[PDB]
Symmetry: C5
């Protein structure tokens, strides 16, 4: 039997936050999904957008696991005590501003959910934002330093609505969100790195 | 008999800041209440507001308790030595800027009061800010990661006065502040998460 | 004979920066004085000012004391090794930007002087700033979490000119600086908290 | 046989982050190459530019090496656990804003690749930016404190296309990127310091 | 013989960074000299300037010394491991933005050179900036908390041109840099504090 204090103590003492939780030479499967909350600023001249999204991030780390047969089966853990995937947005032009407490939810089987609210600026196609078909801003996210044999990134499906959490008070409306996944070889390095491309189809609402 | 040094040493040494002070499998009851001090900027086109408020936050942590029959019965404690609720404003568009010393007041029975002055910008309904009925901006606050069996959130009880500490030098005036607690289920997760919705009814002076 | 290394070692090794240096039955007497250096921005529409001042802060901590019959009688100490009063400006709308090295001067009897240069923005009365009688901006400073029995705040007892070090290159000129102690209760808590109100009477130059 | 955990433990335990991995008194050869991603703001009046670039940095540190006959031959390491060259852009007018996770890739033979995305503002020649031949902004990068007997800086670009990773959505387009190795003695100090000058020839599209 | 690792270990283990390296009740002699790199913004209405300068700072700390008959005689050391003079500019209106790695160079006899590149804004006389005589902005630098028996501050000169490292792409040109030493008594305290005043004589380049 463990209480929350015991679980959290054991995790702090033994999770190796700098060690990717790879098992038998297989990639850590990371799921990412952006839930758009607001679009704060758009510039059709510069092709830049300022956006707030929840970055729902999910993966398994079995070194975190504990027998919860007589115990709580989930806890909140500061991310500084956990390994977290080194995800970056490749077309970000500002550093990610995390708006929320930096805590992940860890299940007793080792499943982790880290879902920060992030404000970040992007360079992307803003053309058509003012028309009915709208603009399509693509956001590319992947591990910065782990190639495909170490981290895979997936846009795991749901029925997950588009503007389920998007602000009704925004000047913009979301028409569609699609996720595409890619495998790229960069000039720097010989291995392929996976990314998810998130296409945000949106437009400016008219005053009426 | 303890002096302040002993109380604070004991809190610092046995601090478990990462551990939610859950007792008898009941949620930690957190009270929140926003005391509006200033509205610094409002944009009716973008529906954004920049606000300064004291986020009065209250809860009980029995692991902090000490016998105070012959001791001080209250101390100020760095929040880095305490568990603090992971509250977030859901419609915030900037990160909370804490303007005050990050100290909580702890009572010998384990009651904590943490009341930072916060500057933060929010996405909300700014329409009507210039009519007499004013605008109503809604701010939603709740635990980011603890569901309803772990953290409940409630309005601070004490009969809430609206303009109490609000700046007389602001360009805006407060007409009314109301609160409503909700219980919401999001698609990410199967459990319900509690929030308080704070409705700030305000208008431009003139 | 202690040398500076010994003094600073002893302070650092025994320092309890979390512990208010309450002397028996008494509030720690803190003296505060703002020496205005520059007024960088003024907005008469929003009633906001951006200011730079030296926050002269003085108090006694006898736990720091040492026998200096045959030793240096003063040293500079990082404030992270010292208890420091949790002062806040109640009408501040930005968090204090400290422009100087964060060192206090500690005398062998336990007297401490901490005098940071601070840039901060405030909400206050900017009306009349461009007139002959000028504007009067009031800045309210007090302990954020320590009530009247734990901290008292007074203006430094000197006659002194708080506009003495003000920049000659400023667009503004200071006409007068006055201070008044107040003591107030807040809805949150049953005790009185002390503050100093610093009234800065200033105007634009021609 | 070591697993990733062992490799990272061993590196962390013997991380000598402040020690330049000099061998027998001969300079650490550092390769630098800037991969331009975006040009965000250009001001022809002030001669200032705001740029985003991947700063591909490469060097060898044999103290990091491990036998990978039966082990992973590469790991990602927090740069806080590694010595990293003290490179600075001499004409930068803002501190480097690092946009990416601060991890370097370390090969079992001791080769290190650190490649942060950086946003930084520079002072340089913006004249002609809205002509056809374009502007040429020169960025000078070298070790801040290590002279030529301790750090050598070389452009290894490996010959990969200029506009390769540059945003197609930028307002600007890259015409050409060239590099020059320099060796400058400064008035302060008697030894020479190496730098690479990266010349970005770019324009506004039509 | 010590190697670099030994030197740095020994310094890390025994530097007392909060201890002023006073020897026998003498002041620590600190030399300061500003090498101007750029003038970014000037406002003649508000009397404010935004400047970039190398703040060349030099002093001796005998506790850092080591025998280098058969060892490297200089190392780079993080300033977090060293005592550094608590210098401040008295007319600065922003905090000193350090643009460079925060390393000092330490010689085996205990001489230290710390030379950060700093961007900072000042309140000073901007009048005359677009005439041929130019403006003269005075920058006052001294120890914040150490009086003259603990720290003296002294300007030092080289025969180099003041523009050696001034940007040729600035909108301003430097006409002259001079420096004065002062000893001032403030109201707070009974002791004299030393400062160096650095007078930057500059003007706007021809607009064409
Ligand atoms: C795959 N990353 C994305 C761009 C560069 C590359 C990389 C590789 C190794 C270390 N850092 C970055
Ligand atoms: C209640 N939170 C707000 C948005 C998602 C949710 C959540 C749940 C678990 C871990 N992180 C975030
Ligand atoms: C006197 N303080 C300033 C305003 C609220 C009050 C207070 C009391 C206890 C803890 N935090 C804040
Ligand atoms: C190469 N650096 C750039 C300018 C001065 C020089 C330097 C030398 C020693 C310590 N810091 C800086
Ligand atoms: C020399 N400094 C400049 C103004 C105040 C003074 C000072 C003295 C002691 C501690 N802090 C500041």
């Amino acid at each position: 039997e463990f209480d929350r204090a015991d679980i959290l103590y054991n995790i702090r003492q033994t999770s190796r936050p700098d060690v990717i939780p790879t098992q038998r030479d297989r990639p850590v499967a990371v799921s990412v999904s952006l839930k758009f909350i607001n679009i704060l600023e758009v510039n059709e001249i510069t092709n830049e957008v300022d956006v707030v999204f929840w970055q729902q991030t999910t993966w398994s780390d079995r070194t975190l696991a504990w027998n919860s047969s007589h115990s709580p089966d989930q806890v909140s853990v500061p991310i500084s005590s956990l390994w977290v995937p080194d995800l970056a947005a490749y077309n970000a032009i500002s550093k990610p501003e995390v708006l929320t407490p930096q805590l992940a939810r860890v299940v007793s089987d080792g499943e982790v959910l880290y879902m920060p609210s992030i404000r970040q600026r992007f360079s992307c196609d803003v053309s058509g934002v003012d028309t009915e078909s709208g603009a399509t801003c693509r956001i590319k996210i992947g591990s910065w330093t782990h190639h495909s044999r170490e981290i895979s990134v997936d846009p795991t499906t749901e029925n997950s609505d588009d503007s389920e959490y998007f602000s009704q008070y925004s000047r913009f409306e979301i028409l569609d969100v699609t996720q595409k996944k890619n495998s790229v070889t960069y000039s720097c390095c010989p291995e392929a790195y996976e990314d998810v491309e998130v296409s945000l189809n949106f437009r400016k609402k008219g005053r009426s």
